[PDB]
Design a protein around this nucleic acid. Structure first.
Lengths: 133, 128
DNA sequence: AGATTCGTGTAGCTACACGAATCT
DNA sequence: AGATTCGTGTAGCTACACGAATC
């Protein structure tokens, strides 16, 4: 019935499935997602693309910095911080990449169509963001 | 184009909007959903395992979550096994949350076709 | 005795309020 | 003076491994 509930719940289950799948690489689903986004290429910019609030990204990164996944360089402005992947991070990503396909395949296979479902969720997320004012 | 990224990022924004709306009732979306489930289920089945399974959460998470609500005096726990009940304050805030909740639903859902699929996807993962 | 219902310890994810620092 | 980039304190949500208590 509820849109927040059903989505959050599905995210919970999915999070559990993806975490168990990425277990040997010692990565969480969120950390993986962040790594891949960094791998495509400041903080607030990154948080926006990731889809979390600032402070969440901050504490998430410290956990990764401590595990030597990513490094932070001071920005050209002392205000901003820039983010790089470390060798341990790129090697971890590479190790988790095949594991992701093994699980991505299964959950994406059991559906009349995934691309339709996918864009429905995305636009529903953006729909929620419109409450900002 | 991960299935988790889409689903979790959306839920984050969703959960954020729902909490921003439910603020006057002092409730979060998780708290709300729990209460609603408990309220719908009166009498008889109410255990740590069942509510966990029904809400779609691991029991230990619900264990902690309930403790936060018992703190607020919204719920009680009783030995059967454990039984969970709303308090007077429970329905007091829950009924007080219903209009706040229908408000955002109309704003964001403007879909049972989608809900079917989203549920199917969440179930598809729990299968693994 | 073997199976159940369940909490604690440890660890990560999430955001809000308040503000410090810094840059034009 | 007025606008930015970001961190902490505070608090809540999530769950895996392990074992306690109970039939």
């Amino acid at each position: 019935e509820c849109a927040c509930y059903t989505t959050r719940r599905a995210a919970r289950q999915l999070g559990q499935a993806y975490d168990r799948a990425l277990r040997p690489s010692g990565l969480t689903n969120t950390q993986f997602s962040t790594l891949a986004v960094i791998s495509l290429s400041t903080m607030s910019e990154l948080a926006a693309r990731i889809g979390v609030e600032r402070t969440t990204l901050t504490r998430n990164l410290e956990v990764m910095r401590r595990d030597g996944l990513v490094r932070v360089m001071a920005g050209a402005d002392a205000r901003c911080k820039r983010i790089e992947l470390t060798a341990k991070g790129r090697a971890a990503l590479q190790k988790a990449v095949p594991l992701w396909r093994g699980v991505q395949a299964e959950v994406t296979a059991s559906v009349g169509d995934w691309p339709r479902v996918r864009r429905d969720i995305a636009n529903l997320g953006q729909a929620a963001e419109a409450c900002r004012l």
